[PDB]
Enzyme design. Structure first.
Site, PDB file in Angstrom:
ATOM      1  N   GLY A   1      -3.072  11.203   8.645  1.00  8.37           N
ATOM      2  CA  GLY A   1      -3.960  11.421   7.485  1.00  8.37           C
ATOM      3  C   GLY A   1      -5.400  11.072   7.795  1.00  8.37           C
ATOM      4  O   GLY A   1      -5.623  10.166   8.625  1.00  8.37           O
ATOM      5  N   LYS A   2      -6.328  11.790   7.150  1.00  6.16           N
ATOM      6  CA  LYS A   2      -7.787  11.508   7.102  1.00  6.16           C
ATOM      7  C   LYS A   2      -8.062  10.637   5.865  1.00  6.16           C
ATOM      8  O   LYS A   2      -7.103  10.034   5.316  1.00  6.16           O
ATOM      9  CB  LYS A   2      -8.546  12.842   7.078  1.00  6.16           C
ATOM     10  N   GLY A   3      -9.322  10.543   5.440  1.00  5.24           N
ATOM     11  CA  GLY A   3      -9.712   9.769   4.247  1.00  5.24           C
ATOM     12  C   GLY A   3     -11.218   9.650   4.120  1.00  5.24           C
ATOM     13  O   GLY A   3     -11.943  10.336   4.872  1.00  5.24           O
TER      14      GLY A   3
ATOM     15  N   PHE B   1       0.503  -1.157   9.598  1.00  5.70           N
ATOM     16  CA  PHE B   1       1.562  -1.136   8.559  1.00  5.70           C
ATOM     17  C   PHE B   1       2.834  -0.504   9.138  1.00  5.70           C
ATOM     18  O   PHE B   1       2.758   0.202  10.168  1.00  5.70           O
ATOM     19  CB  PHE B   1       1.157  -0.282   7.356  1.00  5.70           C
ATOM     20  CG  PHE B   1      -0.166  -0.590   6.706  1.00  5.70           C
ATOM     21  CD1 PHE B   1      -0.263  -1.565   5.721  1.00  5.70           C
ATOM     22  CD2 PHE B   1      -1.297   0.151   7.024  1.00  5.70           C
ATOM     23  CE1 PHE B   1      -1.471  -1.814   5.083  1.00  5.70           C
ATOM     24  CE2 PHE B   1      -2.512  -0.118   6.407  1.00  5.70           C
ATOM     25  CZ  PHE B   1      -2.592  -1.091   5.429  1.00  5.70           C
TER      26      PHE B   1
ATOM     27  N   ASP C   1      -6.687   2.803  -8.522  1.00  7.93           N
ATOM     28  CA  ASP C   1      -6.568   4.197  -7.999  1.00  7.93           C
ATOM     29  C   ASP C   1      -5.092   4.623  -7.920  1.00  7.93           C
ATOM     30  O   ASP C   1      -4.684   5.163  -6.870  1.00  7.93           O
ATOM     31  CB  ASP C   1      -7.297   4.384  -6.649  1.00  7.93           C
ATOM     32  CG  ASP C   1      -7.746   5.823  -6.310  1.00  7.93           C
ATOM     33  OD1 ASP C   1      -7.904   6.625  -7.234  1.00  7.93           O
ATOM     34  OD2 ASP C   1      -7.969   6.146  -5.107  1.00  7.93           O
TER      35      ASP C   1
ATOM     36  N   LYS D   1      -4.315   2.394  10.504  1.00  6.33           N
ATOM     37  CA  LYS D   1      -5.487   2.848   9.708  1.00  6.33           C
ATOM     38  C   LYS D   1      -6.790   2.330  10.344  1.00  6.33           C
ATOM     39  O   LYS D   1      -6.987   1.081  10.337  1.00  6.33           O
ATOM     40  CB  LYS D   1      -5.342   2.302   8.282  1.00  6.33           C
ATOM     41  CG  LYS D   1      -6.531   2.548   7.358  1.00  6.33           C
ATOM     42  CD  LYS D   1      -6.403   1.916   5.976  1.00  6.33           C
ATOM     43  CE  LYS D   1      -7.535   2.308   5.046  1.00  6.33           C
ATOM     44  NZ  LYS D   1      -7.463   1.605   3.745  1.00  6.33           N
TER      45      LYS D   1
ATOM     46  N   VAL E   1      -5.935   7.519   9.907  1.00 14.58           N
ATOM     47  CA  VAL E   1      -4.605   6.872  10.064  1.00 14.58           C
ATOM     48  C   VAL E   1      -3.870   7.582  11.207  1.00 14.58           C
ATOM     49  O   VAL E   1      -4.045   8.815  11.335  1.00 14.58           O
ATOM     50  CB  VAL E   1      -3.826   6.965   8.747  1.00 14.58           C
ATOM     51  CG1 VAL E   1      -2.445   6.353   8.885  1.00 14.58           C
ATOM     52  CG2 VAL E   1      -4.614   6.350   7.605  1.00 14.58           C
TER      53      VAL E   1
ATOM     54  N   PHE F   1     -12.463   6.418   4.114  1.00 12.20           N
ATOM     55  CA  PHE F   1     -12.529   5.146   4.879  1.00 12.20           C
ATOM     56  C   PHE F   1     -12.440   5.436   6.380  1.00 12.20           C
ATOM     57  O   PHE F   1     -13.035   4.680   7.145  1.00 12.20           O
ATOM     58  CB  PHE F   1     -11.371   4.234   4.469  1.00 12.20           C
ATOM     59  CG  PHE F   1     -10.095   4.988   4.176  1.00 12.20           C
ATOM     60  CD1 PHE F   1      -9.194   5.300   5.188  1.00 12.20           C
ATOM     61  CD2 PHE F   1      -9.814   5.421   2.887  1.00 12.20           C
ATOM     62  CE1 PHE F   1      -8.030   6.000   4.909  1.00 12.20           C
ATOM     63  CE2 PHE F   1      -8.656   6.131   2.615  1.00 12.20           C
ATOM     64  CZ  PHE F   1      -7.762   6.410   3.623  1.00 12.20           C
ATOM     65  N   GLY F   2     -11.681   6.462   6.780  1.00 14.94           N
ATOM     66  CA  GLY F   2     -11.573   6.884   8.188  1.00 14.94           C
ATOM     67  C   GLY F   2     -10.279   7.622   8.493  1.00 14.94           C
ATOM     68  O   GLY F   2     -10.017   8.662   7.845  1.00 14.94           O
TER      69      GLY F   2
HETATM   70  N1  LIG Z   1       3.502   7.423   6.846  1.00  8.09           N
HETATM   71  C1  LIG Z   1       2.693   6.468   6.387  1.00  8.09           C
HETATM   72  N2  LIG Z   1       3.177   5.203   6.357  1.00  8.09           N
HETATM   73  C2  LIG Z   1       2.419   4.195   5.906  1.00  8.09           C
HETATM   74  C3  LIG Z   1       1.134   4.385   5.435  1.00  8.09           C
HETATM   75 CL1  LIG Z   1       0.209   3.040   4.827  1.00  8.09          CL
HETATM   76  C4  LIG Z   1       0.605   5.671   5.442  1.00  8.09           C
HETATM   77  S1  LIG Z   1      -0.960   6.205   4.928  1.00  8.09           S
HETATM   78  C5  LIG Z   1      -0.620   7.812   5.444  1.00  8.09           C
HETATM   79  C6  LIG Z   1       0.656   7.982   5.845  1.00  8.09           C
HETATM   80  C7  LIG Z   1       1.383   6.731   5.923  1.00  8.09           C
END
Ligand SMILES: Nc1ncc(Cl)c2sccc12
EC number: 2.7.11.23
Length: 331
Positions: free
Chosen positions: A18-20, A90, A139, A40, A25, A22-23
Site C-alpha cells: 500500500g501507498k498513503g 506490524f 479516522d 510502514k 508499506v 505518510f509514505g
Molecule cells: N496486510 C497488512 N497488514 C498489516 C497492516 Cl498494518 C497493513 S497496512 C496495509 C496492508 C497491511
C-alpha cells in the site's frame, strides 16, 4: 526501494502492499523470528515524522495493558531509524471491508455477518475508553478495518495516524467527510463520542452496499443528515460557532435551514431509516424476502440500536459497554 534489498542482516524486502499520505508499506521476511511482517516507512520531511512519533507513543502505551479486550487492535512489534526514515513493524493481515463490499458488486453482506462485525467493534471502543488510555481514533471507515485470515470473519483496526488523547487536540478539521460527526461540522470541541457516530454510518452501509450520508462538500453533507434526522436540538446550535453556515435564528428563538438556488433535498426528517433498511418490505431492494434470519422482529432491534448511535447530543449518545448489552446481541 526494489525487490531483493537486504537491510542490516535481518529484513528481506518482497513488494509494495500500500501507498498513503505518510509514505509506503511493504512485505518483508524477518530471519530472527522467521515469519513474514509488514513494514510502514514514513516520508523524509520534518512534518510527517513529528505526527509518526505520536502514533508510536500511543501504540506502545496500549501494549503495556494485558486485558481480554485489547485483541481487536493491530499488534506493533518494533520500530527503528534507517537512511533517515522512521520505520514501524506490524503483523501481516488480509484485505479490508471495502474490497469485501466491492466483491458483492455493492449488494451488501448478511444481517448475521453484520452483527458479528458490530460486536467485535463495540469491544475495541470499550478498550480505548480505559481512563488511563482515553484515545480517539479520528479516522474510522471501511478501508481502515482488515480481516485477520481470508477464510474467517475476525477483524482488527489500523492507521493511528490521526489519533489523539482526550484534551491533546491539534486540528479542528478531522475525520473523512462521509463519516464526519455533527459537532465537528459545527466547529465545537470533540471527545470520544465522534468514533461511535462513525460506527453507526459504517454498519448500515455494510448491509445496503452504499454509504448512508455521501456529501460532496461540508454544506451538502449536513443537508443529507437533516433529510433523515431533522433539525438539531436548539440548546446545541446556541453554543456552536459555525451554526450560521447551515441555519438561521428566529425572533421567538427557533432555527430553520438556509436558502439555496434549486433538483434535490426532501423535507427535514421525512427520509425515515424504516425504508432505507426495508424492515416491513423484505430488506434492501427486498433482496432478502425468502432468506431466514431476516425476520421483521430482528429488523426492529437493528433499527433501534443504529438510532442510539446517531443521537445529535454527544452527552446522551450510547457508549461501548451499554451497546454490548443491547437486545440485538441477545440469543
Ligand atoms: N496486510 C497488512 N497488514 C498489516 C497492516 Cl498494518 C497493513 S497496512 C496495509 C496492508 C497491511
Amino acid at each position: 526501494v526494489k525487490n531483493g534489498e537486504k537491510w542490516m542482516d535481518r529484513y528481506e524486502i518482497d513488494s509494495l502492499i500500500g501507498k498513503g499520505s505518510f509514505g509506503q508499506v511493504v512485505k518483508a521476511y524477518d530471519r530472527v523470528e522467521q515469519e513474514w511482517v509488514a513494514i510502514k516507512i514514513i516520508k523524509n520531511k520534518k512534518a510527517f515524522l513529528n505526527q509518526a512519533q505520536i502514533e508510536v507513543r500511543l501504540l506502545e502505551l496500549m501494549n503495556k495493558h494485558d486485558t481480554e479486550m485489547k485483541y481487536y487492535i493491530v499488534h506493533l512489534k518494533r520500530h527503528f531509524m534507517f537512511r533517515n526514515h522512521l520505520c514501524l513493524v506490524f503483523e501481516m493481515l488480509s484485505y479490508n471491508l471495502y474490497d469485501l463490499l466491492r466483491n458483492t458488486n455493492f449488494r451488501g453482506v448478511s444481517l448475521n455477518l453484520t452483527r458479528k462485525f458490530a460486536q467485535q467493534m463495540c469491544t475495541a471502543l470499550l478498550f480505548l475508553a480505559t481512563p488511563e488510555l482515553s484515545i480517539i481514533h479520528c479516522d474510522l471507515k471501511p478501508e481502515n478495518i482488515l480481516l485477520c485470515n481470508p477464510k474467517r470473519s475476525a477483524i482488527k483496526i489500523v492507521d493511528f495516524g490521526s489519533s489523539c488523547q482526550l484534551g491533546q487536540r491539534i486540528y479542528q478539521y478531522i475525520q473523512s467527510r462521509f463519516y464526519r460527526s455533527p459537532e465537528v461540522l459545527l466547529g465545537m470541541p470533540y471527545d470520544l463520542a465522534i468514533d461511535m457516530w462513525s460506527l453507526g454510518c459504517i454498519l448500515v452501509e455494510m448491509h445496503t452496499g452504499e454509504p448512508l450520508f455521501s456529501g460532496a462538500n461540508e454544506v451538502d453533507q449536513m443537508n443529507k443528515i437533516v433529510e433523515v434526522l431533522g433539525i438539531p436540538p436548539a440548546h446545541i446550535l446556541d453554543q456552536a460557532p459555525k451554526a450560521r453556515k447551515f441555519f438561521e435564528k428566529l425572533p421567538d428563538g427557533t432555527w430553520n435551514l438556509k436558502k439555496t438556488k434549486d433538483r434535490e433535498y426532501k423535507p427535514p426528517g421525512t427520509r425515515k431509516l424504516h425504508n432505507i433498511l426495508g424492515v416491513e418490505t423484505g430488506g434492501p431492494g427486498g433482496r432478502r424476502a425468502g432468506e431466514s434470519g431476516h425476520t421483521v422482529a430482528d429488523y426492529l432491534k437493528f433499527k433501534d440500536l443504529i438510532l442510539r448511535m446517531l443521537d445529535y447530543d454527544p452527552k446522551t449518545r450510547i457508549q461501548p459497554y451499554y451497546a454490548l448489552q443491547h437486545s440485538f446481541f441477545k440469543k
